[PDB]
């Protein structure tokens, strides 16, 4: 990751030289074996340069890592895919495609992997602007490097410009102020700049949806807001299956049972359940090797479900019942139907 | 109103003597004509004594004056009628009938006429304890006259003890305090005292549901809370029809059109629409009599729909969009389903 072609040449170079300095003696030269251990050493000792240069890439989440969220899935399809994959209908009905949408909800409930998924269906380059980048632009007073971000979105079109943690700045000046940050204002300017063409969609997501600039939520700007709740039972069984993918997990482990036990568990907590089960399998397997080598020389092939019990004993429902309460209060702050239901004639 | 049998005898006496002092001359004595004008004069000059003695009476609202509120109607039936009209099933399933329920919502949206209606189906004596009575008990430090109210409910069983404006005291000490009022505590004592038998149901209703004592909302006490929203289109067409009942209203007036125009209008505002239409019909009819008698001697049979236009010009949606917002926030403070939906097995 963060490896340009010259970095890859350096990687192959140092791996081949690790093979050379592993052989360590002319026919033996031709019999060199560049084995995966050499490439792993080269990776552990490779200094890449292409970090801090944000990568545009169609991500790999495929909407099955993020299960559930079916109405949110329909809104995201209608907001991203329909403008770009069926653009004739939009110009037929005269609807301008929406410039942006704004996720909100509990932290780490599958918001980043919910814009990657729709960027994957859209086959659009995904540009994630994390919260530290916005903060860095707010502190160096370099509020004009978000012109570069939007320009990079323009060249890398179609896009999903995931302004992750859009309320980082508002948290960073909690309190003389009141609205309209340094670089939030530049995001507003360069968001009002581009037309509804060029298929660049800003999906900036906020943990705290009330402290944000209310000028962001104006129409034309990120006017659609989409509540991303805590995972439903389908959503968190898909989350548990996705976090445990590529990891050798047992057959007698019942992942739907785990997803059925865990009600208020955010997606990040469901990762930390698996990352404390994998870690505990590491501990047991390493201890197995240790007491084998010291005694038997002189295996835990899979994460057994007894690891998903003593690992799940340290289960912290990280988001409170009063955080999601306030997110619901903001949610039907945005719900003001109020009697215009059954509008018939 | 407020007339005991001795007061009715005094009423007939003064009406008959008004007939006597209207005749004002023995055969003419037998030809006295006690006409309705004499009874109306007697009523206008009758001093009744039975006021300030609260009346227990099966009220006349019949659930059609309060239209709509269908789920609220089902909850009130299940809470009042089913304990008293089908009590075998409750002792079969071991369910104790709930001691009380607590309405809340926007002021004057049909909360008083929503406990009268269910007291009418239940055919239960309806005891309305208005907010000034609770305030009077809180100021005189006579917090032991609510023992008498509950005792009167016990004798007048089955009851609907509508503790109207239960949060009068909490408004009267808005702010050193914090909870547990003088006579709210006695309401709690005599509410916990009576058993689930005797069929006495407390339906105390609050405009402000958050300032009330949180010990009221404990189970056993007024644990069920029922949101009484602003009238729906069926509800406010029934309200407009009920307020205009006994008043001569035209045929070309379209009351469903009125109820369809008025979205945020509380029930009290829909009364003041009709009580400014009736008042303007009074003005036009009286002015008709005035310019007839001064000129033609020397009719507005009905409230025409041109009165319901210039009367509707002075239409004040009295409850704001921020009051009902807070009532909805309290309502989904009482909604924490949150993932236990689709609890299957």
XYZ file of C-alpha atoms in Angstrom, chain B:
345
model
C -75.725 23.255 36.309
C -74.861 22.975 39.971
C -78.546 22.808 40.931
C -79.714 20.450 43.688
C -83.409 19.638 44.097
C -83.971 22.588 46.425
C -82.328 24.819 43.813
C -84.639 23.366 41.172
C -87.641 24.104 43.395
C -86.351 27.666 43.759
C -85.970 27.824 39.967
C -89.565 26.723 39.349
C -90.693 29.076 42.125
C -89.003 32.122 40.624
C -90.180 31.216 37.113
C -93.781 30.885 38.311
C -93.500 34.187 40.156
C -92.081 35.815 37.029
C -95.217 34.590 35.269
C -97.257 36.071 38.139
C -95.460 39.439 37.973
C -95.713 39.401 34.169
C -99.489 38.871 34.158
C -100.151 41.684 36.680
C -103.922 42.207 36.495
C -109.704 34.743 39.770
C -110.111 33.052 36.392
C -107.088 34.994 35.123
C -105.140 33.220 37.873
C -105.892 29.769 36.448
C -104.848 30.960 32.970
C -101.231 31.674 33.939
C -98.727 30.723 31.238
C -95.305 29.741 32.556
C -93.454 30.326 29.288
C -89.798 29.548 28.482
C -88.920 33.248 28.828
C -89.833 32.987 32.522
C -87.578 29.950 32.939
C -84.726 31.728 31.152
C -85.173 34.736 33.442
C -85.248 32.405 36.448
C -82.019 30.781 35.270
C -80.391 34.178 34.755
C -81.436 35.166 38.300
C -80.929 31.805 40.055
C -78.147 31.559 42.618
C -77.104 27.885 42.738
C -75.344 26.340 45.734
C -74.142 23.002 44.343
C -71.168 24.490 42.519
C -67.734 23.683 44.056
C -69.195 20.250 44.807
C -67.689 18.176 42.008
C -70.259 16.221 40.019
C -69.930 12.530 39.186
C -71.811 11.764 35.973
C -71.553 9.569 32.883
C -70.614 12.251 30.328
C -72.033 12.636 26.814
C -69.278 12.620 24.177
C -69.935 9.209 22.482
C -66.544 9.013 20.635
C -67.931 10.823 17.570
C -67.283 14.323 18.874
C -63.689 13.108 19.219
C -63.187 11.541 15.813
C -60.024 9.842 14.699
C -57.516 8.838 17.382
C -58.129 5.226 16.418
C -55.081 3.632 18.042
C -55.633 5.838 21.093
C -59.255 4.661 21.045
C -58.081 1.040 21.036
C -55.652 1.658 23.910
C -58.351 3.398 25.954
C -60.839 0.603 25.299
C -58.256 -2.036 26.278
C -57.420 -0.045 29.421
C -60.936 0.868 30.641
C -63.664 -1.280 29.093
C -61.829 -4.620 29.033
C -61.028 -4.517 32.794
C -64.654 -3.748 33.640
C -66.776 -5.279 30.870
C -64.705 -8.465 30.464
C -63.125 -8.991 33.903
C -63.176 -12.800 33.695
C -60.392 -12.843 31.099
C -58.112 -10.669 33.241
C -58.344 -13.031 36.210
C -57.959 -15.936 33.780
C -54.615 -14.692 32.458
C -53.543 -13.272 35.816
C -53.046 -9.771 34.423
C -53.655 -7.060 36.930
C -55.591 -4.203 35.306
C -53.524 -1.040 35.084
C -54.224 1.499 37.818
C -53.838 4.515 35.555
C -52.857 6.017 32.218
C -51.391 9.418 31.435
C -52.326 11.430 28.357
C -49.949 14.077 27.053
C -49.557 16.282 24.023
C -50.392 19.722 22.657
C -52.829 21.827 24.694
C -56.494 21.589 23.775
C -56.177 18.791 21.219
C -59.080 16.778 22.612
C -57.721 15.280 25.827
C -60.606 16.064 28.183
C -63.185 14.941 25.614
C -61.063 11.839 25.145
C -61.492 10.617 28.723
C -65.168 11.598 28.761
C -65.692 9.450 25.655
C -64.136 6.364 27.218
C -66.007 7.040 30.460
C -69.107 7.087 28.259
C -68.386 3.693 26.703
C -67.456 2.361 30.141
C -70.643 3.990 31.539
C -68.420 5.039 34.430
C -68.816 8.106 36.600
C -66.418 10.734 35.274
C -64.555 12.812 37.858
C -62.562 15.699 36.399
C -59.995 17.256 38.738
C -59.010 20.427 36.932
C -55.616 22.086 37.295
C -56.846 24.948 39.500
C -58.082 22.400 42.056
C -54.638 20.783 42.303
C -53.091 24.250 42.511
C -55.550 25.268 45.252
C -54.584 22.168 47.222
C -50.901 23.009 46.698
C -51.301 26.611 47.932
C -53.569 26.182 50.926
C -51.269 23.355 52.068
C -54.464 21.275 52.140
C -52.821 18.272 50.519
C -55.267 15.971 52.353
C -58.328 16.971 50.313
C -57.140 14.638 47.552
C -57.783 11.755 49.921
C -61.395 12.939 49.731
C -61.248 12.963 45.916
C -60.000 9.375 45.754
C -62.558 8.359 48.389
C -65.326 9.935 46.298
C -63.963 7.963 43.349
C -64.124 4.801 45.470
C -67.792 5.365 46.293
C -68.617 6.490 42.740
C -66.932 3.411 41.191
C -66.393 2.578 38.346
C -64.592 5.836 37.593
C -62.483 7.816 35.180
C -60.576 10.111 37.516
C -59.340 12.656 34.973
C -56.627 14.555 36.854
C -56.689 17.301 34.246
C -53.500 19.345 33.901
C -51.496 17.130 36.240
C -48.426 19.329 35.656
C -50.067 22.545 36.905
C -47.926 22.465 40.043
C -44.706 21.752 38.150
C -45.433 24.774 35.973
C -46.201 26.707 39.170
C -42.722 26.025 40.591
C -40.660 26.049 37.396
C -37.000 25.848 38.368
C -34.612 24.466 45.731
C -36.918 21.746 44.467
C -36.744 19.252 41.636
C -39.627 16.753 41.987
C -42.225 15.260 44.335
C -44.803 18.024 44.864
C -46.965 18.449 47.969
C -50.172 16.983 46.577
C -48.649 15.054 43.690
C -47.113 12.900 46.427
C -50.535 12.397 48.004
C -51.932 11.498 44.583
C -49.183 8.865 44.445
C -50.060 7.609 47.940
C -53.802 7.225 47.310
C -53.006 5.877 43.851
C -50.821 3.083 45.222
C -53.361 2.457 47.971
C -56.427 1.254 46.085
C -56.217 -2.233 44.601
C -56.629 -3.144 40.944
C -60.209 -3.995 41.888
C -62.940 -1.350 42.410
C -62.387 -0.320 38.764
C -61.125 3.220 39.420
C -58.979 4.438 36.536
C -56.853 7.583 36.735
C -56.397 9.272 33.367
C -54.511 12.372 34.491
C -53.382 14.380 31.489
C -50.406 16.719 31.134
C -49.696 19.431 28.594
C -46.001 19.255 29.558
C -45.053 15.585 30.077
C -41.409 16.091 31.145
C -41.800 18.490 34.088
C -44.083 16.017 35.866
C -42.905 13.862 38.762
C -41.017 10.879 37.292
C -42.356 8.803 40.191
C -45.800 9.120 38.595
C -44.605 7.225 35.521
C -43.379 4.233 37.545
C -45.191 0.921 36.922
C -48.227 0.429 39.122
C -48.828 4.173 38.918
C -49.764 6.037 35.666
C -47.348 3.838 33.755
C -49.084 3.848 30.381
C -48.531 7.115 28.544
C -50.614 7.874 25.467
C -49.638 10.631 23.058
C -52.652 12.687 22.003
C -51.452 14.386 18.803
C -52.998 17.257 16.914
C -56.251 16.241 15.167
C -55.989 14.221 11.963
C -58.282 15.106 9.041
C -60.982 12.714 10.265
C -60.442 13.938 13.822
C -60.752 17.611 12.986
C -63.694 17.171 10.642
C -65.404 15.455 13.575
C -64.279 18.306 15.844
C -65.642 20.915 13.422
C -68.916 18.999 13.113
C -69.200 18.696 16.902
C -68.456 22.357 17.634
C -71.013 23.403 15.008
C -73.652 20.979 16.302
C -76.820 22.632 17.734
C -75.778 25.714 15.772
C -77.668 26.374 12.514
C -74.960 25.889 9.898
C -75.479 26.117 6.153
C -75.591 23.282 3.646
C -73.163 24.856 1.171
C -70.459 25.078 3.845
C -67.847 22.375 3.241
C -66.621 21.275 6.668
C -64.325 18.614 5.234
C -62.722 21.418 3.206
C -62.160 23.363 6.445
C -60.696 20.299 8.150
C -58.499 19.689 5.113
C -57.141 23.262 5.115
C -56.147 23.159 8.778
C -53.076 21.037 9.466
C -51.476 22.272 12.679
C -54.746 23.469 14.197
C -55.368 22.203 17.718
C -58.910 21.411 18.812
C -59.269 24.636 20.793
C -58.366 26.671 17.713
C -60.969 24.727 15.748
C -63.477 25.738 18.402
C -62.409 29.379 18.154
C -62.917 29.159 14.391
C -66.547 28.157 14.985
C -66.929 30.517 17.967
C -65.816 33.395 15.743
C -68.114 32.215 12.936
C -71.065 31.914 15.317
C -70.073 35.281 16.798
C -69.987 36.931 13.388
C -73.340 35.361 12.542
C -74.543 37.014 15.767
C -73.096 40.332 14.579
C -74.704 40.142 11.140
C -78.079 38.958 12.449
C -78.197 41.654 15.139
C -77.183 44.336 12.634
C -79.962 43.020 10.380
C -82.494 43.439 13.194
C -81.091 46.889 13.999
C -81.360 48.406 10.532
C -84.695 46.655 10.017
C -86.295 48.032 13.181
C -85.033 51.597 12.815
C -86.112 51.860 9.152
C -88.470 49.113 7.977
C -90.544 48.986 11.163
C -90.571 52.796 11.264
C -82.135 37.701 8.709
C -79.177 35.284 8.511
C -81.105 32.068 9.315
C -77.843 30.099 9.276
C -74.082 30.583 9.440
C -73.368 31.164 5.749
C -70.044 30.044 4.335
C -69.023 33.674 3.825
C -68.891 33.800 7.621
C -66.553 30.781 7.655
C -64.166 32.705 5.389
C -63.834 36.012 7.229
C -63.976 34.053 10.486
C -61.182 31.808 9.189
C -59.190 34.928 8.270
C -58.583 35.231 12.033
C -57.214 31.701 12.379
C -54.406 31.300 14.917
C -52.573 27.989 14.899
C -52.101 28.250 18.639
C -49.682 25.366 19.204
C -46.299 25.999 17.604
C -44.187 23.673 15.498
C -41.680 23.594 18.363
C -44.173 22.507 21.031
C -45.373 19.414 19.165
C -41.734 18.789 18.278
C -40.866 18.464 21.971
C -43.930 16.295 22.554
C -42.714 13.974 19.788
C -39.237 13.935 21.340
C -40.794 12.843 24.624
C -42.926 10.294 22.751
C -39.882 8.562 21.251
C -38.127 9.004 24.536
C -40.811 6.460 25.433
C -40.003 4.450 22.280
C -36.902 2.284 22.751
C -37.847 -0.754 20.671
C -34.435 -0.431 18.996
C -33.568 -3.787 17.450
C -35.861 -6.103 19.390
C -38.246 -5.802 16.465
C -38.455 -9.098 14.550
C -37.887 -11.013 17.779
C -38.873 -14.361 16.300
C -38.164 -17.484 18.279
